[PDB]
Amino acid sequence: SLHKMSMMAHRVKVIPYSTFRLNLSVTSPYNADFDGDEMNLHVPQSEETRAELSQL
Amino acid sequence: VFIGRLPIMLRSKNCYLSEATESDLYKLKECP
């Protein structure tokens, strides 16, 4: 985490098994891979903030 | 006259495990 492209927002898609799952082509901007890497997740507690995270 | 006592390493000199064989080590619950 040293740049904007590494703290992008997403739409949720609640799924099974204990693992966060993300599209292969948003790998890079995070420089993440699928061999042991955890990842963080936050969640705005409001509306405006969601907008701030959706429209920015 | 007394001093205290000294941590000993296993399989060393002054330990029993130096003394044991496959058979013995087993009933000593110790690993071969």
């Binding site: 098994y17 204990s18 693992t19 292969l24 790998t27 891979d33 699928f34 061999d35 042991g36 | -």
Partner: protein
């Protein structure tokens, strides 16, 4: 298995492949306090929100008990002022073995061993 991941044949681990087998262990001691004022292990009546009822009155739980969540393992008590020792928040297993004896001081000493198996679940390192 894209970008360094591995898609793994479920039916083949269904046959038992890469099946782990875990064990934690918990300890405790009746900790005196000078005037031969000693601790102990019990089932009580400030206490903690577990579900002791898996205990035997002696302050324990015995092999075969399928334990989960935050269910007391050991019910130690101190001058009442609860002192029991619950399961680990994260984990959910099945008691395996437990050992009582006395310290260098000669007071009670209980170490509980709870087993469990682990299973190749999507997202496990290899």
């Amino acid at each position: 298995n894209q970008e360094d991941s591995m898609i793994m044949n479920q039916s083949s681990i269904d046959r038992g492949l890469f099946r782990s087998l875990f064990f934690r262990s918990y300890m405790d001691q009746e900790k005196k306090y000078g005037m031969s004022i000693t601790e102990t292990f019990e089932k009580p009546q400030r206490m903690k929100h577990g579900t002791y009822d898996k205990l035997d009155d002696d302050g324990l739980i015995a092999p075969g008990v399928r334990v989960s969540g935050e269910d007391v393992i050991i019910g130690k008590t101190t001058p009442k002022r609860d002192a029991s020792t619950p399961l680990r928040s994260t984990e959910n297993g099945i008691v395996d073995q437990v050992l009582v004896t006395t310290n260098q001081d000669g007071l009670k000493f209980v170490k509980v061993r709870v087993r469990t198996t682990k299973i190749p679940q999507i997202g496990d390192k290899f």
